[PDB]
Amino acid sequence: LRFIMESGAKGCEVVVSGKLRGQRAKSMKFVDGLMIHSGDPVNYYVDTAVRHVLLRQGVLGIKVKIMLPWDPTGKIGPKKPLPDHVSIVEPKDEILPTTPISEQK
Amino acid sequence: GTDLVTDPFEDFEFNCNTKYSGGVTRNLMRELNGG
Amino acid sequence: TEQMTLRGTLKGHNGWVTQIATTPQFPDMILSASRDKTIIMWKLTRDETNYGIPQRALRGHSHFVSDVVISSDGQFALSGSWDGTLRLWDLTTGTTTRRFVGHTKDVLSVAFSSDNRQIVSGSRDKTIKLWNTLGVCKYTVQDESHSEWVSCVRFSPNSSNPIIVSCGWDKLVKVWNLANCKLKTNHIGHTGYLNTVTVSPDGSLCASGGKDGQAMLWDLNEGKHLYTLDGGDIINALCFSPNRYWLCAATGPSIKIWDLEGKIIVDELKQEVISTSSKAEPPQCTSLAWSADGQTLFAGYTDNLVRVWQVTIG
Amino acid sequence: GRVRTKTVKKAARVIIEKYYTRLGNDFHTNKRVCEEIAIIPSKKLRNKIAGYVTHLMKRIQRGPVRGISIKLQEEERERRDNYVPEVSALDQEIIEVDPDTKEMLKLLDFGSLSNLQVTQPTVGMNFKTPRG
Amino acid sequence: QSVQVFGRKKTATAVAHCKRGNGLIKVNGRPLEMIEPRTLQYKLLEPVLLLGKERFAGVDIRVRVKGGGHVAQIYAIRQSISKALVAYYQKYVDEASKKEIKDILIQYDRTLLVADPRRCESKKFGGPGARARYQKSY
RNA sequence: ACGAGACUCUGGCAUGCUAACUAGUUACGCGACCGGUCGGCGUAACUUCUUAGAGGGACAAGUGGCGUU
C-alpha cells in the first residue's frame, strides 16, 4: 500500500481473504486514500487484479485495486478527468493602484 | 507447500475473543514490552 | 444629439442582430445573426410603411455565427461560427458556395484582407501564420506567442494601407503595421474584454473599453501611456462615427454615446413598453446603430417582437 | 425531483463569484461562458451549472446572497460601512434624564451640566407582565 | 442549390420534389377522395377551397410515397403540403404570405411538425416483457 | 472519504454539417400518341428517406401561483 501511494496513486485497496489461521476464513481489507466503486469511471480510473496464493493449508485470495491519478497525456493514468470534478481557470491577475503608473524600460 | 506467518498484532486482532484469547494477549504483551 | 421616435411597429422575425457591418463596394445586402441554423437578410425601402422585410430563411450554416463581415466586395460574405468553420455566402448561385472546415482548433471568427494578401485565422495551438493566394509562406509566430485564445483580426476600414490588428475575447489586442511590424513591450493590466475595435484609416487611433471603464488609449508607434478615459460595461455592439472619431455603447435598453470633445449628451428621450405586473421583468434589447446615413433604426426584444425607429439625425 | 446536487451548486457559486461580470440573465450566454472559463467534463453537468448560475444571478439582481461574495456588493458594503452622518447622534441639544440618573450624576460630580432636562418619574410601578 | 426535405412521418415518406409544372391534384398520383384503404381521405380537400384555381397552376410536387402504416403515411401528406406551401411562398414572393398560410395550417393542427416519440421498449430479466414478471411461487 | 447523483449504453429531434457504383435521385430521357414521372439495365444534387460521426439540443430555461419568498 505504501509503495502504491508513493508511486503516485490517488488511492488503493488490498483485500486478503481466506485462511488467516484457524478453521474459519477471515478477510482483511486495507483501503488507504480515495477510490470510487460505481459508474463508468471505474473502467478507466480503477485498475484491479485478483490472485490466488497456494499455501500449505489452502488458497488465499489477494485483490488489489488502484485508482489512477488524473494525467493529461503520457498514458500513466487516464486522460479524461472524473466527470463530477469541475475545474475553474483563474481569471487574469489585476493589481492596479489608484493612479496607473507602470514600470517601463 | 508453505504457510503464512502472523504478527502478534494480527494474532490478537483475530483471536481476541476465542479459545486462544489468553495466549494471544500474552504474546502481544510480550511483543510490546518483553525486555 | 439627434431626434428619434418609434413611428410604428412590424412583426415577423426569429433571429436578432448582434454586430453591425457592411462593405462599401456592394452594400446592396445586409445581414443579421441567428441561432436557427440561419443568417437573415434585411432590405431597404426608406418609406413610412416599410421598415424591415423577411425574404429568405438562409438555412445551411453548421452553427450560429460570432460576428458578421463581408469581403471588400459584396460577392463573398465571410461568416465565422463559434467553432472554427468558415462559410462564404454568395449571390452567384443565390446561396453559400464554399464552406471550410480545415482548422484543427476552434477558431472564433474569420477576416478578409483589404488587398487579398494575408489570410489570418485564430488557431488554439498558440501558432498563428499568414496565408496568401499566391503560394508563398509569408510569416509565422513561433516564440513568445499569445497566452490565451485569439478571436478575430481587423484591418483598415477604408481604402488605405492594410494594417493588422489582432483582437480577442482574451482581453489581449495587438496592433501592427506591415512596414515596421515590431513589438515594443508586453504588459498586463487589462480590466475588460473587447468585442471589437477599429483602427484609424491613417494609423493613429485604436479605441478601447472595459467593464472598469478605464478605456486607455493606444498608438501605433509604441505603447506609451497617454490617457485612460471612462466607460461602462463590456461592449456587445459598436458603430464608429463615419465622419469623426467618437465612441458609443449601450448598457442594456439605454444607449450611451461618449464624444471625445464634449463628453455630454444633449437630449436623450426613450420609449419603453409597460405592463401591469411589477415583479415581471420587461423584455430587453441589446444595442442600436445607424447603417450608412442614419434614417432608419432597428431593434428587437426578447418577447419575439421586432421594432423599428425613425430618426432625424440633425 | 429537480434538486441540484452540491456539485453543481458549488461549481456555480465559484463561477459566479469569480466571473460575475461576464455572466448575465440569459441561459445561452451563461452556458457559453461556463464553457469558456471552466472545464466541465459533461455537457449535462455544464447545462445544470449554467441553469443554476442563471437562477443565482436572478437571486442577486434583487439583493445579496450569503454564499456568494462578488466584488461589487463587497465594495458597496465597504463604502456603506464607512458612512458617517453630518452631525453625531450623541449631539443632543437637550437630553432627557430621570431624577435618579440626575442624582447619580450629582454624586459623580457632574451637577453643572446644562444639556440635561429632568423628566417627571412614572407614577406607577407596573413593569412586569402578568403571570399565567 | 437544392433545398429538399419533402415529407416524412413515423416510418413513411412522401418525397416532394417541388418545382414548376402541371401540379394537378393527386395523392399517390390518384384522385381527390379515391384512395383504396379509404380511411383518411378528406385531409387534403380542405385548403384548396379557400384560395382558388389559379394558385395551383405552377406548383408541381412530384411525390415518391413509400411506407406502410396509416398514421405514418397519412399525416405525412399534411406535413408535405405544409412544407411545399412554406417553401414556395418563402422563395417566390415573401415569407408574410407563407407566414399566413402556415399560420392557418399549423395553428389549425399541432401534430404535423410533432411525431409520436413512443416506441417499443426493451425486454428485461425474469419476465415475459418490459414490465411483466414471471409468476413468483412460495 | 465511500454510496446517491454525476457517469456509460440506449431511445426521442435536426428542411444544419461530414457523403456513400451494395438499399434510395435523375426531364442533353426510350422500353409510349387521341403536351401526366413508366423496375436485370438508367447511378459532372457534397443527400432529404438509409447508414454513422463530429457536433447541436433540455436547463425547472420562460411565465403565473405557493413556499423562510
From Swiss-Prot, chain A:
Record's GO cellular component terms: cytoplasm; cytosol; cytosolic ribosome; cytosolic small ribosomal subunit; endoplasmic reticulum; extracellular exosome; focal adhesion; membrane
GO molecular function: class I DNA-(apurinic or apyrimidinic site) endonuclease activity; damaged DNA binding; DNA binding; DNA endonuclease activity; DNA-(apurinic or apyrimidinic site) endonuclease activity; DNA-binding transcription factor binding; enzyme binding; Hsp70 protein binding
Phosphoserine modifications at: S87, S102
Compartment annotation: Cytoplasm; Nucleus; Nucleus, Nucleolus; Mitochondrion inner membrane
Cross-link Glycyl lysine isopeptide (Lys-Gly) (interchain with G-Cter in SUMO2) placement: K92
Endpoints of the signal sequence: none
Entry keyword annotation includes Electron transport: no
Effect noted on mutating T73A: No effect on phosphorylation by PRKCD
Post-translational modification Phosphothreonine, affected residues: T98, T99
UniProt modification remark: Methylation by PRMT1 is required for import into the nucleolus and for ribosome assembly.
Covalent link Glycyl lysine isopeptide (Lys-Gly) (interchain with G-Cter in ubiquitin), residues: K80, K92
An annotated GO BP: cellular response to reactive oxygen species
N6-succinyllysine, modified sites: K10
Keyword Phosphoprotein: yes
Keyword terms of this UniProt record: Acetylation, Apoptosis, Cell cycle, Cell division, Cytoplasm, Cytoskeleton, DNA damage, DNA repair, DNA-binding, Isopeptide bond, Lyase, Membrane, Methylation, Mitochondrion, Mitochondrion inner membrane, Mitosis, Nucleus, Phosphoprotein, Ribonucleoprotein, Ribosomal protein, RNA-binding, Transcription, Transcription regulation, Translation regulation, Ubl conjugation
Similarity remark: Belongs to the universal ribosomal protein uS3 family.
UniProt name for this protein: Small ribosomal subunit protein uS3
Species name: Homo sapiens (Human)
From Swiss-Prot, chain C:
Positions carrying Phosphotyrosine: Y51, Y227
Pfam families associated with the record: WD40
Free-text note on domains in this protein's UniProt record: The 7 WD repeats mediate protein-protein interactions with binding partners.
GO terms assigned for molecular function: BH3 domain binding; cadherin binding; cyclin binding; cysteine-type endopeptidase activator activity involved in apoptotic process; enzyme activator activity; enzyme binding; identical protein binding; ion channel inhibitor activity
Main location (coarse class): membrane
UniProt key word Secreted: no
Positions annotated as WD repeat: 12-43, 60-90, 102-132, 145-177, 189-219, 230-259, 280-310
Keyword terms, alphabetized: Acetylation, Apoptosis, Biological rhythms, Cell cycle, Cell membrane, Cell projection, Cytoplasm, Developmental protein, Gastrulation, Growth regulation, Host-virus interaction, Membrane, Nucleus, Phosphoprotein, Repeat, Ribonucleoprotein, Ribosomal protein, Translation regulation, WD repeat
Name of the protein described by the UniProt record: Small ribosomal subunit protein RACK1
Tissue specificity statement from the Swiss-Prot or TrEMBL entry: In the liver, expressed at higher levels in activated hepatic stellate cells than in hepatocytes or Kupffer cells. Up-regulated in hepatocellular carcinomas and in the adjacent non-tumor liver tissue.
PANTHER family in the cross-refs: RECEPTOR FOR ACTIVATED PROTEIN KINASE C RACK1
GO annotations of cellular component type: cytoplasm; cytosol; cytosolic small ribosomal subunit; dendrite; extracellular exosome; IRE1-RACK1-PP2A complex; midbody; mitochondrion
UniProt modified residues of type N-acetylthreonine: T1
Effect of R59A: Decreased binding to PTK2/FAK1
UniProtKB/Swiss-Prot annotation, chain D:
Modification after translation, per record: Ubiquitinated at Lys-102 by RNF14 and RNF25 in response to ribosome collisions (ribosome stalling).
Compartments where found: Cytoplasm; Nucleus, Nucleolus
Chief location category: cytoplasm
Known partners and oligomeric status: Component of the small ribosomal subunit. Part of the small subunit (SSU) processome, composed of more than 70 proteins and the RNA chaperone small nucleolar RNA (snoRNA) U3.
Function description: Component of the small ribosomal subunit. The ribosome is a large ribonucleoprotein complex responsible for the synthesis of proteins in the cell. Part of the small subunit (SSU) processome, first precursor of the small eukaryotic ribosomal subunit. During the assembly of the SSU processome in the nucleolus, many ribosome biogenesis factors, an RNA chaperone and ribosomal proteins associate with the nascent pre-rRNA and work in concert to generate RNA folding, modifications, rearrangements and cleavage as well as targeted degradation of pre-ribosomal RNA by the RNA exosome.
Xref: PROSITE patterns: RIBOSOMAL_S17E
Chain segments annotated as transmembrane: none
GO cellular component, one term: nucleolus
Gene name of the encoded protein: RPS17
HAMAP family: Ribosomal_eS17
Keywords: Cytoplasm, Diamond-Blackfan anemia, Isopeptide bond, Nucleus, Phosphoprotein, Ribonucleoprotein, Ribosomal protein, Ubl conjugation
GO biological process, one term: translation
The organism of origin for this protein: Homo sapiens (Human)
SUPFAM superfamilies: Rps17e-like (SSF116820)
Crosslink site: Glycyl lysine isopeptide (Lys-Gly) (interchain with G-Cter in SUMO2): K102
Residues carrying Phosphoserine: S112
This protein's name: Small ribosomal subunit protein eS17
Residues bearing the modification Phosphothreonine: T129
Swiss-Prot record, chain E:
Keyword field: Acetylation, Cytoplasm, Nucleus, Phosphoprotein, Ribonucleoprotein, Ribosomal protein
GO cellular component terms given for this protein: cytoplasm; cytosol; cytosolic ribosome; cytosolic small ribosomal subunit; extracellular exosome; focal adhesion; membrane; nucleolus
Pfam families, per database record: Ribosomal_S9
GO biological process, any: ribosomal small subunit biogenesis
UniProt-annotated location(s): Cytoplasm; Nucleus, Nucleolus
GO molecular function: RNA binding; structural constituent of ribosome
Modified residues (N6-acetyllysine): K53
SUPFAM superfamilies for the chain: Ribosomal protein S5 domain 2-like
Gene3D superfamilies (UniProt xref): 3.30.230.10
Xref: InterPro entries: Ribosomal_Su5_D2-typ_SF (IPR020568), Ribosomal_uS9 (IPR000754), Ribosomal_uS9_CS (IPR020574), Ribsml_uS5_D2-typ_fold_subgr (IPR014721)
Similarity field: Belongs to the universal ribosomal protein uS9 family.
Described function: Component of the small ribosomal subunit. The ribosome is a large ribonucleoprotein complex responsible for the synthesis of proteins in the cell. Part of the small subunit (SSU) processome, first precursor of the small eukaryotic ribosomal subunit. During the assembly of the SSU processome in the nucleolus, many ribosome biogenesis factors, an RNA chaperone and ribosomal proteins associate with the nascent pre-rRNA and work in concert to generate RNA folding, modifications, rearrangements and cleavage as well as targeted degradation of pre-ribosomal RNA by the RNA exosome.
PANTHER family for this protein: RIBOSOMAL PROTEIN S16, RIBOSOMAL PROTEIN S9
The name this protein goes by in its record: Small ribosomal subunit protein uS9
Name of the coding gene: RPS16
